[PDB]
Amino acid sequence: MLEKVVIANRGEIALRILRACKELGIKTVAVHSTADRDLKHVLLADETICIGPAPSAKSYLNIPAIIAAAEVTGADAIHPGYGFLSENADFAEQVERSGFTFIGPTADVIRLMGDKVSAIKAMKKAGVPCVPGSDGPVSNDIAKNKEIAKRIGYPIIIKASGMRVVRSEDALEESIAMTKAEAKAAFNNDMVYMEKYLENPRHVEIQVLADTHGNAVYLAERDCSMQRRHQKVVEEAPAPGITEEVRRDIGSRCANACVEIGYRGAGTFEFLYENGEFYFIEMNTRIQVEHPVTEMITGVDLVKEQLRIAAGLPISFKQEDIKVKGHAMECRINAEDPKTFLPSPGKVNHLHSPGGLGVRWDSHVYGGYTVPPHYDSMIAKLITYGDTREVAIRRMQNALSETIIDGIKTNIPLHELILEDENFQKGGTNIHYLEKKLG
Amino acid sequence: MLEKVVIANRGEIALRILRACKELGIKTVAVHSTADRDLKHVLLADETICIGPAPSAKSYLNIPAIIAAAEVTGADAIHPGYGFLSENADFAEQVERSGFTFIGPTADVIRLMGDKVSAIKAMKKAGVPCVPGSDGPVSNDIAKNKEIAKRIGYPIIIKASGMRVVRSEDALEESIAMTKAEAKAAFNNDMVYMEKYLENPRHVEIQVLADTHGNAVYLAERDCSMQRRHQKVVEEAPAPGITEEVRRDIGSRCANACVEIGYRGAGTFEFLYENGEFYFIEMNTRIQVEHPVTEMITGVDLVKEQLRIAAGLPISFKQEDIKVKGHAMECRINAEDPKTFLPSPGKVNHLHSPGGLGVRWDSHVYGGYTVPPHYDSMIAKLITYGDTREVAIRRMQNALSETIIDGIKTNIPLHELILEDENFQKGGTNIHYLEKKLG
Ligand SMILES: Nc1ncnc2c1ncn2[C@@H]1O[C@H](COP(=O)(O)OP(=O)(O)CP(=O)(O)O)[C@@H](O)[C@H]1O
Numbered sequence: 001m002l003e004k005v006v007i008a009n010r011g012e013i014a015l016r017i018l019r020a021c022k023e024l025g026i027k028t029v030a031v032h033s034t035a036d037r038d039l040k041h042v043l044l045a046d047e048t049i050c051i052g053p054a055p056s057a058k059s060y061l062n063i064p065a066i067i068a069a070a071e072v073t074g075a076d077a078i079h080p081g082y083g084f085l086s087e088n089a090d091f092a093e094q095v096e097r098s099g100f101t102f103i104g105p106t107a108d109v110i111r112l113m114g115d116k117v118s119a120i121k122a123m124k125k126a127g128v129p130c131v132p133g134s135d136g137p138v139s140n141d142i143a144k145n146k147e148i149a150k151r152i153g154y155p156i157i158i159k160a161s162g163m164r165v166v167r168s169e170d171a172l173e174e175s176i177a178m179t180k181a182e183a184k185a186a187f188n189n190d191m192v193y194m195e196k197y198l199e200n201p202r203h204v205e206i207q208v209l210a211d212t213h214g215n216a217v218y219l220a221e222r223d224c225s226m227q228r229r230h231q232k233v234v235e236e237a238p239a240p241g242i243t244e245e246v247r248r249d250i251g252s253r254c255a256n257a258c259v260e261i262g263y264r265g266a267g268t269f270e271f272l273y274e275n276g277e278f279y280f281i282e283m284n285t286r287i288q289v290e291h292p293v294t295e296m297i298t299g300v301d302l303v304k305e306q307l308r309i310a311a312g313l314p315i316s317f318k319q320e321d322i323k324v325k326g327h328a329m330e331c332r333i334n335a336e337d338p339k340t341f342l343p344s345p346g347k348v349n350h351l352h353s354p355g356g357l358g359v360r361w362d363s364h365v366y367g368g369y370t371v372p373p374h375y376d377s378m379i380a381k382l383i384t385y386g387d388t389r390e391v392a393i394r395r396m397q398n399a400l401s402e403t404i405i406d407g408i409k410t411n412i413p414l415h416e417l418i419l420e421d422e423n424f425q426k427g428g429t430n431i432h433y434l435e436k437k438l439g
Numbered sequence: 440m441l442e443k444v445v446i447a448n449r450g451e452i453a454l455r456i457l458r459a460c461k462e463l464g465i466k467t468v469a470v471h472s473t474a475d476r477d478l479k480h481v482l483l484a485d486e487t488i489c490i491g492p493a494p495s496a497k498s499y500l501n502i503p504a505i506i507a508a509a510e511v512t513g514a515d516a517i518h519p520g521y522g523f524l525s526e527n528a529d530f531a532e533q534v535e536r537s538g539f540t541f542i543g544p545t546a547d548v549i550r551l552m553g554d555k556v557s558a559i560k561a562m563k564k565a566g567v568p569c570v571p572g573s574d575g576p577v578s579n580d581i582a583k584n585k586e587i588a589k590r591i592g593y594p595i596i597i598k599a600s601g602m603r604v605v606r607s608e609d610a611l612e613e614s615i616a617m618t619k620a621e622a623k624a625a626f627n628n629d630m631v632y633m634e635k636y637l638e639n640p641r642h643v644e645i646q647v648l649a650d651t652h653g654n655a656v657y658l659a660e661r662d663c664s665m666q667r668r669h670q671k672v673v674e675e676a677p678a679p680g681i682t683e684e685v686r687r688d689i690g691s692r693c694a695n696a697c698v699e700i701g702y703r704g705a706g707t708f709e710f711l712y713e714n715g716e717f718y719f720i721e722m723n724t725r726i727q728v729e730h731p732v733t734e735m736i737t738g739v740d741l742v743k744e745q746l747r748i749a750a751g752l753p754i755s756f757k758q759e760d761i762k763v764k765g766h767a768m769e770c771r772i773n774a775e776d777p778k779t780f781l782p783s784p785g786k787v788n789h790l791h792s793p794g795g796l797g798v799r800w801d802s803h804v805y806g807g808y809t810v811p812p813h814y815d816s817m818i819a820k821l822i823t824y825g826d827t828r829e830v831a832i833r834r835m836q837n838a839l840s841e842t843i844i845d846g847i848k849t850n851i852p853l854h855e856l857i858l859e860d861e862n863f864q865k866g867g868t869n870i871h872y873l874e875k876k877l878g
């Protein structure tokens with residue numbers, strides 16, 4: 001089965017994967033850039049290989065170097081984590097062709113859901129609800145396009161398979177002409193469609209697992225609406241307002257979609273959720289940053305399941321075994337200025353991480369560690385669990401109050417502002433809320 | 440109700456109590472000695488009061504100073520934690536007479552279970568199984584005593600209401616004479632009884648809660664057999680080998696005992712468990728160090744329940760709501776030499792605490808903190824949870840491997856030795872095992 005895994009990532013998720021591997025007795029190979037020799041998981045790994053200099057392009061995105069690392073160590077499998085190459089179908093393809101197991105879906109499935117028109121087509125076919133839209137690429141005939149846009153109803157948004165919002169017919173012809181011409185020079189792909197622009201939605205996403213035994217399960221949902229410039233700040237599970245009846249409906253549709261498309265591994269169906277209706281926007285064909293809140297409310301170890309699935313085993317439980325219990329919250333702690341959001345690299349002179357009942361800390365940072373400039377700014381994920389949403393929130397507030405990260409700036413002050421916001425405490429704020437509140 | 444609580448303790452348990460208070464919106468008063476100004480919970484408390492110089496006798500055992508702290512701050516209640524004054528009936532009595540709520544049982548109940556002959560009498564009356572014994576204090580008539588000892592069956596142990604084991608009648612007369620004469624000069628109490636000496640037992644203990652609404656519940660059990668010189672090192676829950684049928688039997692008997700004796704708050708019934716039978720040895724009438732493993736397998740917040748009960752509320756759930764799920768382990772991390780077990784006070788130059796899924800860390804220690812000489816040596820409790828005992832163990836091993844405490848010695852190496860022991864991995868080793876293994 002899986003005896004040795006290359007962890008083709010860094011930071012916190014690399015450590016999360018290492019922990020899962022070690023629990024399963026799987027040997028680890030940490031591939032790393034020159035700037036990441038001091039990463040906690042590298043220091044804990046069974047074997048280490050330097051795959052390039054600091055810049056991501058030369059290291060964590062270096063496909064030949066990563067595959068060569070699997071070859072020399074006689075590894076069986078490669079775990080891409082999230083970001084980097086995790087949704088690069090060329091990578092997945094090269095990994096399998098080279099005789100290693102890619103811990104993720106097949107390349108064909110990555111490419112399928114990597115294209116928005118084809119992803120949407122497959123979801124429609126599978127019975128997953130989608131944003132009303134052109135359903136297919138848009139013509140050049142502006143007459144047909146004004147007809148379609150009128151059908152859908154303004155405002156619409158033009159999107160390449162990057163986006164442009166149109167609130168009247170007055171503007172439709174140019175808007176389609178530009179998004180098409182600017183999306184064709186950016187990525188030799190002039191294909192664009194239109195769909196309804198939802199002005200007041202939440203971000204609600206369904207976690208799935210699918211195995212090579214033909215099983216697929218849903219693991220409730222997460223609300224990730226608390227965002228700034230499309231970057232998630234706080235996530236929670238379950239999503240406030242979502243009943244078990246609604247959960248079973250949408251969840252079961254996502255599970256069926258997995259089987260229809262030949263899905264394998266962990267994945268997430270993202271929806272815009274508005275006026276009680278779900279509308280599909282994307283499938284992330286990988287583990288995600290915010291997976292821990294789902295773990296806390298379902299009792300599933302999502303990274304362990306990824307490894308078991310990749311080894312050819314069935315998912316370790318059945319749908320009927322999963323029941324949402326309690327509530328969980330996650331704050332993404334970033335090394336950045338809490339007001340300008342400019343990164344804040346440098347030496348963590350002192351770290352004090354919080355603890356106690358219902359507090360989980362997923363972080364590679366340690367006292368004496370230097371946060372490098374070269375990658376993203378996430379340094380920790382603080383996760384709380386409680387019997388109710390109110391308890392999870394209070395526990396997060398207290399845990400943040402205990403957290404000390406000296407020597408660099410963090411966004412802890414932003415989390416504190418969010419957690420004490422009366423609207424957030426009520427729950428169900430939309431994806432625009434944080435930017436509105438920040439001014 | 441409870442608006443303000445004096446935390447009449449220190450170290451990790453003081454922090455645990457502070458966290459519960461803050462979650463409930465209860466104001467905190469940290470009473471502390473001069474040596475504990477730098478304790479994490481003191482730094483987080485709403486109000487602080489110095490109750491004396493470093494030595495415990497002059498501070499944490501200073502009854503007038505602690506009560507005076509409650510008086511001046513206009514506190515409502517005092518939480519004694521464990522150790523110190525938590526099972527001092529004189530303290531409980533003075534706290535209630537002074538108009539404060541003692542977060543614990545009534546003084547009369549403390550004194551009742553604080554005496555072994557009367558504790559045993561009450562348990563017998565309540566239907567809790569006890570070690571076969573004289574049932575009452577022993578005569579002076581050695582004839583009657585040889586009759587009783589013969590009934591019970593050697594080896595017996597003489598115990599003052601400290602202990603002396605007798606393996607033949609040859610020795611019985613003196614043995615009873617001495618334990619009686621050495622227990623009367625030590626604590627003006629010459630009262631001694633005899634009971635069966637169990638040579639091969641495990642330490643299995645049942646957690647209860649009882650409220651002022653007449654409810655009492657049991658929360659499964661813990662195995663605390665891994666001990667050195669009667670000091671617990673590793674605890675787990677549930678106890679290996681214990682079926683749900685057996686759990687309900689013994690558990691329900693403990694719950695009834697609570698109601699029969701007028702119990703209030705959290706408590707623990709300790710048993711020696713041998714050849715499939717339970718034998719009562721003591722009731723701890725307080726929260727215990729190892730409470731977290733029970734929290735992890737039942738989903739109950741035991742310190743929050745203590746506070747709710749003390750405020751006059753019912754226990755927040757019913758017996759039928761509790762079901763054991765998974766398995767949990769706790770390692771007591773002490774600042775001590777891992778071989779000589781001599782304390783190791785001094786400055787923690789660097790702390791790195793472990794994390795991830797299923798890892799809980801309950802500790803007041805932080806980088807830069809100096810562990811003082813004046814109190815016990817416990818610096819942290821590392822707690823893991825898993826679906827199975829095997830997973831909890833592997834997770835504990837990995838978490839220990841990640842743990843760094845620089846500047847002082849710890850017993851982490853002892854925990855590592857224990858966790859990889861094949862007999863411990865099988866489970867069910869007796870209370871003598873660790874001393875035997877250590878030689
Ligand atoms: N029909 C619609 N109506 C309103 N907002 C929409 C929309 N379609 C997309 N959006 C918003 O624009 C975002 C699209 O982002 P984009 O497709 O460029 O990559 P992304 O990374 O931000 C989303 P993902 O997390 O799936 O990668 C969505 O997250 C959504 O918030």
Ligand SMILES: Nc1ncnc2c1ncn2[C@@H]1O[C@H](COP(=O)(O)OP(=O)(O)CP(=O)(O)O)[C@@H](O)[C@H]1O
Pocket residue numbers: 570596601634635636637638669709711720721723870
């Ligand atoms: N009948 C018996 N047979 C065998 N061992 C016994 C016994 N009675 C007591 N013991 C052992 O001697 C110990 C008694 O310890 P003692 O009563 O002096 O205070 P203690 O603090 O060690 C127990 P506790 O944790 O309840 O305070 C028990 O823990 C038990 O291991």
